[PDB]
Amino acid sequence: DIQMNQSPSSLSASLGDTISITCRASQNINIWLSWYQQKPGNVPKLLIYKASNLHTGVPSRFSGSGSGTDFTLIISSLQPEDIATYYCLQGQSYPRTFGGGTKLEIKRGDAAPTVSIFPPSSEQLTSGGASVVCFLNNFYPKDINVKWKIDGSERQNGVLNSWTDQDSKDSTYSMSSTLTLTKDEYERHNSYTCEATHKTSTSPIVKSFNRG
């Protein structure tokens, strides 16, 4: 089996930049290498075939090269619509194998997350049916930490986290965190706090409310 090693697993760049993505085959695959683009929510699209041949609908800013085991995809003058994940594929031997992929992100100034906390809705409270939600929105860079405290005490049990892909409008990331309790336990406590720890500060951003 031929293994395809694709470097820059993740690549941060700026619009207009010239960037390159690499593909190393653990075995000579001649010219049988193609490149694909996949936008979030969409199906992969063929960019380059036979290592260096531009597919019919692909702009000239896309070019590929290489023979044997080393291949490179170059995007000159990065555009907003180019922000996506890129994969290489060897078509010489079975099984057919893809590269690990390269996820493009746009660089921007560091941003602290806007934090909002939400007590259980009355509907869920009838019942029952208790979920507390906290949004950590529009922050940069990617990594972020969330901590839940109930009446001071750290709670990790029934926590559910989700993360958005890079926002296309402002290049920021967001996170949703839902703490689910039983109606009974929720009503035995008062203070509920959501703490966000981001790169932008050694001090966590705290949001909370009283009564439950």
Binding site: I31, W32, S34, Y36, V43, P44, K45, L46, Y49, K50, N53, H55, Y87, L89, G91, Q92, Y94, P95, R96, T97, F98, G99, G100, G101, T114, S116, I117, F118, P119, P120, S121, E123, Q124, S131, V133, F135, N137, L160, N161, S162, W163, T164, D167, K169, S174, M175, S176, T178, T180, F209
Partner: protein, 214 residues
């Protein structure tokens, strides 16, 4: 122009079977090798199987991950590509794609995909709870909890309110999925104006609206 349309996906028990089919058009079915590829959410594509044409033996190739469990075949008389999926496992859950191989052994054209979910959990309508704040700008939210399987569709004001929205991917917790969405508007915008959360879940014929009230 080349077109591929797959069908036959859905929810199936672990160990169960599923029969996928791909309708090919706009090209000569017999002239091209055909393949099946799948992709799990947040993963790289995974090639599954290739079948040659009549001139080249009509023989097949499989990935080790599905070998023996998945069978690829073709119906020349209707230009249909088949994938028989037996002994399904939870990690087989993904979007399945009918894909053509063009010149230079190149998987050139892809289909839209058919979704397959392998789980013991049963279909379940979502709940959907509005999320009102505890100025300048205000952040509202919408919580969609306890549904199965994927997916659901969430909009704000029927899609008219698309700016300042953060819709988070669904996360499984059993059992059941949870999905959330937030919308941030000018403080003078709400509650002076009406913002409603629209959720739809076809697998349960769920179609619910939840207005965010202060």
């Amino acid at each position: 122009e080349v077109k591929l349309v797959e069908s036959g996906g859905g929810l199936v028990q672990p160990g169960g079977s599923l029969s996928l089919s791909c309708a090919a058009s706009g090209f000569t079915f017999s002239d091209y090798y055909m393949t099946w590829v799948r992709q799990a959410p947040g993963k790289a594509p995974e090639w599954l199987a290739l079948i040659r044409n009549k001139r080249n033996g009509d023989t097949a190739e499989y990935s080790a991950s599905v070998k023996g469990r998945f069978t690829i075949s073709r119906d020349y008389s209707r230009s249909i590509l088949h994938l028989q999926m037996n002994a399904l496992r939870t990690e087989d859950s993904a979007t399945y794609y009918c894909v053509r191989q063009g010149r230079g052994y190149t998987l050139d054209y892809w289909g839209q995909g058919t979704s397959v979910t392998v789980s013991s959990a049963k279909t379940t309508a979502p709940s959907v709870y509005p999320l009102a704040p505890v100025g300048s700008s205000v952040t509202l939210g919408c919580l969609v909890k306890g549904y199965f399987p994927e997916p659901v569709t969430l909009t704000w004001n029927s899609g008219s309110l698309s700016s300042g929205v953060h819709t988070f991917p669904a996360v499984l917790q059993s059992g059941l999925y949870t999905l959330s969405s937030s919308v941030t508007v000018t403080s003078s915008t709400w509650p002076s104006q009406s913002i409603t959360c629209n959720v739809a879940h076809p697998a349960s014929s769920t179609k619910v609206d939840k207005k965010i009230e202060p």
